[PDB]
Structure 1
Amino acid sequence: AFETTTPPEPPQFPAEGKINYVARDTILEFKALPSYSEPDWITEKFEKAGKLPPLKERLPEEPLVYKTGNMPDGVGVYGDTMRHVVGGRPEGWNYIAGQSQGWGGIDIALSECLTRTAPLFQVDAKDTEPLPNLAKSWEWSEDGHTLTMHLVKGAKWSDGEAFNADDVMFYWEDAVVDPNVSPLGGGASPEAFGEGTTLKKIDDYTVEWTFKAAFPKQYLYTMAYPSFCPGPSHILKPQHPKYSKNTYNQFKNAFPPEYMNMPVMGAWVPVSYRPDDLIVLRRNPYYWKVDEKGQQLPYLNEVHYKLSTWADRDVQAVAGSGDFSNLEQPENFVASLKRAADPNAPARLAFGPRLIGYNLQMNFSANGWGNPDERGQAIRELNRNEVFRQAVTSALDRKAIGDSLVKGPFTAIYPGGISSGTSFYDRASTVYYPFNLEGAKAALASIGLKDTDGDGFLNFPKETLGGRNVEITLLVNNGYATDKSLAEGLVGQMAKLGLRVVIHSLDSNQRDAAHYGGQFDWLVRRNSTELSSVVQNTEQLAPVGPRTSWNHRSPEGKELDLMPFEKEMADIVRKFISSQDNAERADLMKQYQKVYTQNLYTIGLTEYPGALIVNKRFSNVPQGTPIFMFNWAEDAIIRERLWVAADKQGKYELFPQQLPGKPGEGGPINH
């Protein structure tokens, strides 16, 4: 049919950054400390003035204590600002209803979860337990069906109202289970946590999970970001349609970006917003996290998120106006490395493994996901045909694809599936469909695709759509140059084949509704955590549930119209989730990858490494922190643990010695 081989070994990528590997519990623990500390102005300008309760009351009985042994530069000092530059825009503050805050670490810094996984890049193997975040501990029953979860006892929201099970329950019942509410990210569906999995309150600081499978420990990662982020239930519940006279759109848009001081479990709170300009966050006085010395975290008092572009984030970091960047667009690498070459540069650049991938995803729903018309339906039928996918992938010159982004040692031939940069990857297991355009052309002719009008474009058979020319719609993320470069390239190569492809370029917010809704034929997408880690959001590897897959979901309400490879892939993923055996887990992924790549669950375009860019003044930045693994580096670096020595501190605070106001008020509080 096609002469399949294994993908070629990429060029050697030296002068990277080595991770200092550590055991799971070297990072944090939950203990009551003898005495506690904070910035002197809080005690002298707020506590003594009345304005705030003493620190001891603001903190839980047992706070989250960061161990100093795991701190790269040791225990810190208070002061300075973290200046971010984002390419996104806020929709509002309702994360659990599916509103974007702008990305670039803004929703990571606000919405804290039951567990935490991003810092697990530094723990040895891939059978690691996620770190206890809002849930301090958990026990499994002798059978493996029940998880008793113990929450942090005594934590408060950034406004002062207690954090308890009512917030965890509100999210599970009124967002996850509730079919009308859709949490931000497109993957917090009920089955993400297992089919027929329930959750129930015991007491205010104890919740109980009930799983259909025995010890499906892989779900503790789904309890981390983005899928299990509780919101301020005392603010959200009176706006919720089950609890009020609000529609689901009224609830969704109940808190516009202008609405200030929204209650968070995160280290900073939004105090200022200026459309297309800036969002300013100030340290949360009710933060439940401290260091071994009793100092109430964070160290940095202020966070900025400049509303600009994704490319400008890179430009501004190497120049020194922005403090942080994930350099992920190969079109920026050369400019960034040139500025990095200067020894007097304000930022340090550090490349990691090839964990950034892009895949072509085809809509596999033939039972009407996204309500397709006759032309739409005809493409879903082509997409599900294995000979059409084999020809589409073989018409791709993958060497030229990589070279269209950046020439050199960065890119790797990527057929699809598991990222080559991850441990779970097996090269022998990956199926490579080499560049064979003439072969691809002949395969499309064999399924009934020939040019009928002599224009150079292929045609549907006489029986399909009146024998009209083939028309495919490609959904593209408008916020990235890479996505666009790839989208245009694919169109040019699909044109050489004969397939006519139309670019539908939408803004991030729009693109997600058109994708998660099913309103697409083909799409270009950057790979999420499951292809970069396997262990994080494993449910997205196959259609295990009716909404767990990026390219094969079913309409509400209907069962999946799965293909035999997808059915076998879902069996692999379900077995992997409930497996505690590492050798079984390693060969389950060798199996998974082979089924993926040979069947073409997605069609790989290219893969490459991103670099972490941080301003040199920042301390406690872990060595070898990837830009993307269990999550984005914003999460991985532990920003509440970052600090700056007082002789290095910048003068960038826009509300110095101020704290957040009340939810709904103007902004921050002084004087």
Structure 2
Amino acid sequence: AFETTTPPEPPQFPAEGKINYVARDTILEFKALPSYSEPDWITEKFEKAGKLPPLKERLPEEPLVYKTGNMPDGVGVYGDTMRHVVGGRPEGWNYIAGQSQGWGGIDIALSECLTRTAPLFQVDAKDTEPLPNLAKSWEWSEDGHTLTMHLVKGAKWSDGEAFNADDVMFYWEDAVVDPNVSPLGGGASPEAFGEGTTLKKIDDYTVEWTFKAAFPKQYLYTMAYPSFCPGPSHILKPQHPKYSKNTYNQFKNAFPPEYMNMPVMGAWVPVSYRPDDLIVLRRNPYYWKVDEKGQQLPYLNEVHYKLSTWADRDVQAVAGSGDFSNLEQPENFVASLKRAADPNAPARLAFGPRLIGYNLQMNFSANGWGNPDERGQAIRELNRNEVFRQAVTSALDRKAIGDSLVKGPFTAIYPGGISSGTSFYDRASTVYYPFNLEGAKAALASIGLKDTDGDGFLNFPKETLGGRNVEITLLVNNGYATDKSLAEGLVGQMAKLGLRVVIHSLDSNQRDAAHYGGQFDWLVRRNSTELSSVVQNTEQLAPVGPRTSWNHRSPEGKELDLMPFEKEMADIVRKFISSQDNAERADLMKQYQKVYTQNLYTIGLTEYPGALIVNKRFSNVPQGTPIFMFNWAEDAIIRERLWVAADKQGKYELFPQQLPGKPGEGGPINHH
């Protein structure tokens, strides 16, 4: 009944900061170097005092080596602190059991994964193999069902314990396969790695994947952050219910934020924590990454995470008291641009492509996900009705939504689906339902929704819930002004259509528990990587598995009650995952976009670009780094490779010349 078209082209964005494209193998390689070096105080005060082993003995025989050619400013010098500001709060250190550490780069820096993809924003080539990280190399069998994966060899956790296949296997078996454990982020279900996929240990430094499909190369991306970031099994395994008398809740909570020096494969280790104030990390002396001159990374000795608000991160970065921000809330754009416009500004600000998007997601489970009551169930039935979805999207004045956030060329009309800023995007394949409130009102009337009590809100027919008013709950992340503003705008627009929408505003952790547990009717959410990049966590594009979709999961352990268009989307996604043909992949994403946007798998709210803000004293920041593409800029900028020239260094270290203490002990260790 609606006059659909394609979305109008947004205003031209002079998108400052162009990316310097490079080839995949210009960034790093694994190899032995003839000599290695580290900060002088480690050698003088720890090694020479017999308190820490010599550096060569702490490194793998073949460490990960960053190639100087890809370094924007070349080889670094030691020193200084990276000062981050975050809106989140740590629950504890058990990432693989689903605890948040506060976001804003903390878990990104702690939890290293098998592969790495965030720095791939600088590779234009199709289609790029994820960078090796904890997995140094891999080989496909001739038939394409077997993937032999070789691990970094001789690397150690920050506490000196060997990193090997046991850590990989513990994550796979006891975190992924185990249905009672859910790693942080809402993903990492077994089917995210392919239906029926198995993983086995060959030896201490070799694992073997077996896939049902032939060459499903897209799963290498799933082996990067957030889905395959192994934890220290020697510490975690004795707390797991399979190997102790602990319950799953006791395993999840065994490492509270106060527990210091949690072993990591990351560049820095947590050494201090003050509630609602600060987390301090110190350099990991067992870090397994070096530069081409043999200097053990990171260059920065310390990292701070000030516990504040997300809006304060922007404020502190432009003021110069914070060193980094992802300017991603349009309500903060004008004030930030004003401060950045001063030539004496301590920080540089640079917008990227339009990769920040928001969708309204409707719960499509009519078979019990989140155990809904009679009211909840009737909403799942409306959600699954295509005429209802068409009315909701048509009742949205998308120009007004964008203007409510910020004026100017930032926002773009966003019907939903793949972001307009990504290479797989096809405007002609994007179904746009223009603002048509009258048509939206007539469509709801056609499915039996009419105002029978004179209050302007539509009622169910007499047969459903005694003909009461339709009432829909809207789950919102209370940590962001943008999410709240979009939710408030959504309530207003729905009231004009005649639907009563009630906001359920929760902090990040509670919001995640309600979302992943399926305890929602509708929710407002900022897009994740599958919509900004397609290639990162591709399984999230459709219900390919019982728990891969953000808005259609099945209760444990029922099958999905998929609608025909969702089955079509799932088939396209599985075909894309196993394709190495560039023309076929591009065509499949055109088909995917059309099915998504025609059927309204989700309903787009708005889309706009974000800007990376970084203190000017840092060297090695890549030009044109986007705030979000394969992952957040905290990962993409490669913080372990950043450095500050000696004459520009800040004097901000809270534990200078100190190293992390033992897991569960007081805090850091000194030389005297």
Other-structure match for 1:661 = 661
Displacement after TM superposition at 1:662 (Å): 0.2
Q: Which moved more, 1:138-147 or 1:13-22?
A: 13-22
Distance 2:631 2:653 in 1: 28
Match of 1:489 in 2: 489
Superposition deviation, residue 63 in structure 1: 0.1
**Quick check: 1:168 aligned with 2:155?**
no
Relative to structure 1, the CA distance from residue 666 to residue 64 in structure 2 (aligned partners, 3 Å threshold; closer, same or farther) is: same
How far off is 1:50 after superposition? 1.2
Partner-residue secondary structure (3-state), 2:330: coil
Task: Give the conservation status (yes or no) of the 8 Å contact 1:431–1:594.
Answer: yes
* TM-score, normalised by the number of residues in structure 1: 1.00
Instruction: After TM superposition, give the deviation of residue 103 of structure 1 in Å.
Output: 0.2
Shift of 1:389: 0.1
The reply to whether residue 572 of structure 1 matches residue 572 of structure 2 is yes
Shift of 1:524: 0.1
**What's the CA shift for 1:126?**
3.9
CA contact (8 A) 1:94 1:252 kept: yes
Q: Distance in 2 between matches of 1:162 and 1:637?
A: 28
Q: Within 2, Cα distance between the matches of 1:420 and 1:53?
A: 52
- Please give the residue correspondences for 1:453-492 in structure 2 after superposition, counting only pairs within 5 Å: 453-492=453-492
Distance in 1, matches of 2:53 and 2:149, equals 29
Aligned partners of 1:660, 1:229: CA distance in 2, in Å?
A: 21
Percent of pairs identical after alignment?
100
Maintained 8 Å contact 2:15/2:352: no
| TM alignment of 1:625-640, pairs within 5 A | 625-640=625-640
Deviation digits for residues 386-443 of structure 1, max 9, x if unmatched?
0000000000000000000000000000000000000000000000000000100000
Larger displacement relative to structure 2 (122-131 or 248-257):
122-131
Q: Is the 8 A contact 1:441 1:497 kept in 2?
A: yes
Q: Is the 8 A contact 1:273 1:279 kept in 2?
A: yes
Distance (Å, rounded) in 2 between the aligned partners of 1:123 and 1:6: 29
408-417 vs 43-52, greater mean Cα deviation = 43-52
Per-residue CA shift, 1:421-478, capped at 9, x if unaligned? 0000000000000000010000000000100000111000000000000100000000
- What is the 5 A alignment of 1:312-323? 312-323=312-323
Q: Quick one: distance in 2 between partners of 1:272 and 1:535?
A: 37
Native 8 Å contact 2:626 2:633 kept in 1 = yes
Tell me whether 217-226 or 13-22 shows the greater mean CA deviation: 13-22
Provide, for residues 608-663 of structure 1, a one-character-per-residue CA deviation record: whole Å limited to 9, x for no partner: 00000000000000000000000000000000000000000001000000000000
Structure 2: distance between partners of 1:27 and 1:6: 39
Instruction: Work out whether residues 272 and 279 of structure 1, in 8 Å CA contact, stay in contact via their aligned partners in 2.
Output: yes
Shift of residue 124, structure 1, vs aligned partner: 1.4
TM-score, normalised with respect to structure 2: 1.00
Q: What displacement does 1:125 show?
A: 2.5
Inter-partner Cα distance in structure 1 for 2:290 and 2:369: 47
CA offsets, 1:189-238, max 9 Å, x none? 00000000000000000000000000000000000000000000000000
Residue matched to 1:272? 272
Cα RMSD (Å) of the superposition? 0.4
Deviation at 1:488, TM superposition (A): 0.2
Equivalent residue number for residue 349 of structure 1: 349
Matches within 5 A, 1:242-321: 242-321=242-321
Residue ranges of structure 2 left out of the alignment (5+ in a row): none
Say if 2:157 and 2:163, in contact at 8 Å, map to a contact too.
yes
CA contact (8 A) 1:201 1:208 kept: yes
Q: Secondary structure at the match of 2:587?
A: helix
Write the distance in 2 (CA, Å) between the matches of 1:548 and 1:457: 35
Q: Distance in 2 between matches of 1:53 and 1:411?
A: 54
Q: State how far apart, in whole Å, the 2-side matches of 1:604 and 1:358 are.
A: 6
Cα displacement string for residues 34-80 of structure 1 (whole angstroms, at most 9, x for unaligned residues) = 00000000001101111100000000000000000000000000000
SS at match of 1:88: coil
Pairwise CA distance, 1:557: 1.2
- In structure 2, how many angstroms separate the alpha carbons of the residues matched to 1:481 and 1:354? 19
Whether contact under 8 Å (2:23, 2:125) holds in the other structure is no
Are the aligned partners of 1:86 and 1:306 in contact in 2 as well (CA < 8 Å)? Answer: yes
Question: How many residues were matched structurally?
Answer: 671
1:222–1:536 Cα contact (<8 Å) kept: yes
Q: Distance in 1 between matches of 2:469 and 2:275?
A: 44
Match for residue 436 of structure 1? 436
Alignment correspondent of 1:155: 155
Alignment partner of 2:606: what SS? strand
Q: Is the contact made by 1:82 and 1:304 (CA closer than 8 Å) also made in structure 2? A: yes
Q: Is contact 2:5–2:432 with CA below 8 Å preserved after alignment?
A: yes
Instruction: Classify the secondary structure of the residue corresponding to 2:174.
Output: helix
CA contact (8 A) 1:126 1:535 kept: no
Structure 2: how far apart are the matches of 1:51 and 1:263?
18
**Could you tell me how far apart the structure 1 residues matched to 2:139 and 2:407 are?**
51
Whether the aligned pair in 1 keeps the contact of 2:365 and 2:554 (CA below 8 Å) is: yes
Give 3-state SS (helix, strand or coil) of 1:349's partner. Answer: strand
Instruction: For residue 429 of structure 2, give the secondary structure of its aligned residue in structure 1.
Output: coil
Task: Kindly indicate whether the alpha-carbon contact (under 8 Å) linking 2:318 and 2:346 is maintained by their aligned counterparts in 1.
Answer: yes
Deviation beyond 3 Å, 4+ runs, structure 1 = none
Are residue 134 (structure 1) and residue 129 (structure 2) matched? no
Q: CA shift at 1:15, angstroms?
A: 4.6
Specify the SS of the correspondent of 1:212.
coil
In 1: Cα distance, 2:386 partner to 2:456 partner: 24
Partners of 2:450 and 2:206 in 1: CA distance: 64
Superimposed CA distance per residue, residues 309-362 of structure 1 (whole angstroms, 9 cap, x where no aligned partner): 000000000000000000000000000000000000000000000000000000
